[PDB]
Design a protein around this ligand. Structure first.
Ligand code: HEM
Ligand code: HEM
Ligand SMILES: Cc1cc(N)nc(CCc2cncc(CCc3cc(C)cc(N)n3)c2)c1
Ligand SMILES: Cc1cc(N)nc(CCc2cncc(CCc3cc(C)cc(N)n3)c2)c1
Ligand SMILES: C[C@H](O)[C@H](O)[C@H]1CNc2nc(N)[nH]c(=O)c2N1
Ligand SMILES: C[C@H](O)[C@H](O)[C@H]1CNc2nc(N)[nH]c(=O)c2N1
Ligand SMILES: [Cl-]
Ligand SMILES: [Cl-]
Ligand SMILES: [Cl-]
Ligand SMILES: [Cl-]
Ligand SMILES: [Zn+2]
Ligand SMILES: [Zn+2]
Ligand SMILES: [Zn+2]
Lengths: 407, 411
């Protein structure tokens, strides 16, 4: 009921009490751990609202106050009357900051309280959404000195008037199946690209084509918009010692902006809530560039490097991996675009985790996602026991809208 | 019920039914996942059910379920339990049991090899001197002059818990660690406490960087005794690098035989508290963990210094660069000396093949992703993108506390 986590490198032991406030299910049982699985009415709404408002009023040290009770009654009356309720601006900002605070898969949470929240609950059309998103993109990008932000569109009502950004991220590259059988561009985005084409997008059919936004307002059919090219900060990739590296023709965008998740605050559901921070280098250099099902460049790089690729035990893959990741960081740094390396990011997270244990009684964390996808054990998170559990407010997975939507 | 796992690189989806045979608990609940927590005297009543479950599994495996021999064996074991409170495994059941504990070991990436285990039955052993002899034979057999062979030696099972056989070493072969008065450590910091015990017990420590520890062996609940493994039986590999000539002057070496000696083997409810087992190394165990952990030999700085990497900022990835070179050195040195070793790409590729085979033929393969994914270059191995289900099957290997914490000293 009170739980210990140990760091096996430093022998430091921390006590988690926060997990007692956990709410949703993990997918694990006493018989089986699903720790590595990626995806494991009025009546229910009021308890959800109360749980949230209690934590809000507690955070501003006015728990059990008249303003606390009065707000609880107000929301209760509004739910009884309208079947939903509206968050105060202050509650919206608090909720969004805490959904990030509670994101157990995010290594970057030391930043959680600095989030800029853009209230877009007055948005009514896909054109309005496009405007709000361009403004987010420009604010967050900030000419390369990136600032974390979320833009929050109107909440779900009857679930047939949902706001959705159909893209997985605000900025991502198109993927295309070739007559060859190969894939051009990013294979992760093949399905989305075809939907864009079928909705009328004129595709350049290149390796790095920024996708258009496909925006859905008020449950209407989604519309296409091109983000002003000048708002999309991109970085050409070069290496500080290998001059041939630039000839691979690689680039990536500076702004990681997740746009397919659902923000739940106080039982209310924000189905369009694009949010952004800045990259950890491995996300580009390890995942985006080296996953077999992504740009899959390891072979080409190793070849240019003149490595012995006859045997796995020469560690040619591992050598090329490091060099690709060196180049990502170098390129971002030279262009003054915010980026963090995995050593720095994980050190920061351990510091954050100790803060959270000390001031909050715990910090839900998913080791499988927190440990970087390269050089795991030489980062301080590897030896850190973590407890994974679900707190609200939260960011949740949601199905792709093209399965859900009826045209 | 059917449970699905997906591979996110290939989209291949497997279905697990084996989890239905799971019994022991995980540490997890619907409210908390303890997937990254390292650690999350029986009655007759509890014992016969464990026995029956085991023997039903054994007899099914040999295509003799419900046969006269199956029923006769159940009857024989039942009667043995009622009159003696325990029972003895037949040699065939022991072999099967030990093989299955390995097959069921969810943290083991090397399980493709599970059916090839050499089982040494040491259940006739009575003294620490007897244990020493058995352990030397195991070492010599498993080493096989570098052509390593997997093996387990099984000492008498627990009776009342007052007469346990224990190997006090964590591994049969490991290097001493010495805490200096200035707070630094000589040799391996993982073994400081056990080294101190050995010394207190009368070991004359050479006090160098790579001193093979003596065996500390407890037979039949008696106080443990010290023995030195004959040095000619301890195969070691000097570490050098194929291109960097100065790497040898770091003075590094490692032993070839990884042999876990502190775990408990449970078969059919019986508890084998001394069951040392060995295979061969995956290179990253030495190159990543043993050499580069900050609380182990911690060599990353010295190596990167010698490579003249820019060490003023972590974002040059100097640590990652030195890490790869060290791991290249380990594999190169082992291969050059013809001592069995497996790289993490080969080992993980083999594991995924093993795993898919297990799903097909067995209905599943319990696996602990946290341990299976190698400690460097995680996502460029095929296990990273593989969903896994972790659950506990018996026969099994289990953690047991270090014996100096529990031992009642005779004097
Ligand atoms: C400011 C710098 C940030 C850094 C360096 C960072 C880092 C990361 C990384 C490395 C991941 C896992 C990457 C992957 O596996 O795809 C992740 C996941 C995540 N982060 Fe962050 N993050 C940052 C900001 C944010 C912000 C601003 C939010 C929300 C306001 C957020 C919420 C999340 C969520 C919900 C996940 C899991 C997403 C999923 O399941 O797909 N993070 N973060
Ligand atoms: C034959 C070659 C083998 C290879 C390459 C191999 C590989 C490994 C590795 C890399 C680990 C994780 C250990 C760590 O990182 O400290 C491990 C764990 C383990 N293996 Fe193996 N293994 C092999 C053979 C065996 C054998 C013969 C057995 C028993 C008969 C065994 C049973 C186990 C168990 C029980 C664990 C978990 C240990 C713990 O929790 O401390 N393995 N294996
Ligand atoms: C099936 C599935 C489930 C799930 N929960 N998430 C995903 C998307 C995983 C994913 C892939 N690439 C990128 C991201 C974003 C990671 C990310 C997000 C932010 C805000 C900052 C930052 N530095 N990095 C997330 C897929
Ligand atoms: C606290 C704790 C718990 C636990 N379950 N295991 C340990 C020890 C883990 C451990 C540490 N170093 C080494 C090993 C050996 C793993 C190993 C075993 C075998 C047989 C072959 C092979 N290649 N590798 C295991 C510690
Ligand atoms: C806290 C964390 O679970 C712990 O450090 C684990 C992680 N994965 C591991 N994996 C292996 N193979 N060996 C280990 O010792 C560990 N340590
Ligand atoms: C199957 C496995 O859980 C899956 O590949 C996960 C592993 N860890 C990850 N960790 C991060 N940060 N991002 C990911 O996409 C994944 N994928
Ligand atoms: Cl990845
Ligand atoms: Cl991935
Ligand atoms: Cl390690
Ligand atoms: Cl470790
Ligand atoms: Zn779990
Ligand atoms: Zn990946
Ligand atoms: Zn380690």
């Amino acid at each position: 009921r009170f739980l210990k986590v140990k760091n096996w490198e430093t022998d430091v032991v921390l006590t988690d009490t926060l997990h007692l406030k956990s709410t949703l299910e993990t997918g694990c049982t006493e018989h089986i751990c699903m720790g590595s699985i990626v995806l494991p009415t009025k009546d229910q709404l009021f308890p959800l609202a109360k749980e949230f408002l209690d934590q809000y009023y507690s955070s501003i040290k006015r728990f059990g106050s008249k303003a606390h009770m009065d707000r609880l009654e107000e929301v209760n009356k509004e739910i009884e009357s309208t079947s939903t309720y509206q968050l105060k601006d202050t509650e919206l900002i608090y909720g969004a900051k805490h959904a990030w605070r509670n994101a157990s898969r995010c290594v970057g949470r030391i930043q959680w309280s600095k989030l800029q929240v853009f209230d877009a609950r007055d948005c009514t059309t896909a054109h309005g959404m496009f405007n709000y998103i361009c403004n987010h993109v420009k604010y967050a990008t900030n000419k390369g000195n990136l600032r974390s932000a979320i833009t929050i569109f109107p909440q779900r009502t009857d679930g047939k008037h949902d706001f959705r950004v159909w893209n997985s991220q605000l900025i991502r590259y198109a993927g295309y199946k070739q007559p060859d059988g190969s894939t051009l561009g990013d294979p992760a985005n093949v399905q989305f690209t075809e939907i864009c084409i079928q909705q009328g997008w004129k595709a350049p059919r290149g390796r790095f084509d920024v996708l258009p936004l496909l925006l859905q307002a008020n449950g209407n059919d989604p519309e296409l918009f091109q983000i002003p090219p000048e708002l999309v900060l991109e970085v050409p990739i070069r290496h500080p010692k290998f001059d041939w590296f630039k000839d691979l023709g690689l680039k990536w965008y500076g702004l990681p902006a997740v746009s397919n998740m659902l923000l739940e605050i106080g039982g209310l559901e924000f189905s369009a809530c694009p949010f952004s921070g800045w990259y950890m280098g491995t996300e580009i250099g390890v995942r985006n560039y080296c996953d077999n099902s992504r740009y899959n460049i390891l072979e080409e790089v190793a070849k240019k490097m003149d490595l012995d690729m006859r045997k796995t035990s020469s560690l040619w893959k591992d050598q090329a991996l490091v060099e690709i990741n060196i180049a990502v960081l170098y390129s971002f740094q030279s262009d003054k675009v915010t980026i963090v390396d995995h050593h720095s990011a994980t050190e920061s997270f351990i510091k954050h985790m100790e803060n959270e244990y000390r001031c909050r009684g715990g910090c839900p964390a998913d080791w499988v996602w927190i440990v970087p996808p390269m050089s795991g054990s030489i980062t301080p998170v590897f030896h850190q026991e973590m407890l994974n559990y679900r707190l609200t407010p939260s960011f949740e997975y949601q199905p792709d809208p093209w399965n859900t939507h009826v045209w």
